Amino acid sequence: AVERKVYPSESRQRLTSYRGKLLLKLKWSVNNGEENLFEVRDCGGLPVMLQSNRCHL
Amino acid sequence: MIVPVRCFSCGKVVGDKWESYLNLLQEDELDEGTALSRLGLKRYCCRRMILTHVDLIEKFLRYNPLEKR
Amino acid sequence: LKYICAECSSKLSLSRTDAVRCKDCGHRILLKARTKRLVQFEAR
Numbered sequence A: 001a002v003e004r005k006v007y008p009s010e011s012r013q014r015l016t017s018y019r020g021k022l023l024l025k026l027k028w029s030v031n032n033g034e035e036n037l038f039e040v041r042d043c044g045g046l047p048v049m050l051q052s053n054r055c056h057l
Numbered sequence B: 001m002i003v004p005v006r007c008f009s010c011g012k013v014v015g016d017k018w019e020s021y022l023n024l025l026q027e028d029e030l031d032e033g034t035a036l037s038r039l040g041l042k043r044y045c046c047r048r049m050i051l052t053h054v055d056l057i058e059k060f061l062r063y064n065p066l067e068k069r
Numbered sequence C: 001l002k003y004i005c006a007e008c009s010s011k012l013s014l015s016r017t018d019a020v021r022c023k024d025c026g027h028r029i030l031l032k033a034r035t036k037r038l039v040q041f042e043a044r
């Protein structure tokens, strides 16, 4: 569905972590450039610090 | 947080003077000593109670769990 | 009505064996409301 912004007050009240999704796009290269398979992979919810450029405050 | 009812040292009721102190500071251009004297605070024990009050209740009140923000 | 949404602050009644969420918005945190009860104190 459509996601909604989460602010650290909710993380504090829920007694859980305040983390954002981390995405790496792998390069499944074969034979030095014969063909490359690309696929972004989510690698868990990475914690972020407050008041940073990746925080909603 | 909110103004104390009485002075800690002597016990004089100073809880009814915080709003008047702010009025005399804002409307009238009174310095703090003059405003405290004109409120009737002569002892420095009573003067400090109003001269040094912080009034954090106003900042507390902005976080209201009972009204949509 | 015994609960308050932690974000939109709208009073909501949560029945037993029911989803714990605000009906208006999608918030899963609810605050128990304080109802009228006798609570003695000493003015000291």
Ligand SMILES: [Zn+2]
Binding pocket: B007, B008, B009, B010, B011, B012, B043, B044, B045, B046, B047
């Ligand atoms: Zn005094």
Ligand SMILES: [Zn+2]
Binding pocket: C005, C006, C007, C008, C009, C010, C022, C023, C024, C025, C026, C027
């Ligand atoms: Zn709600």
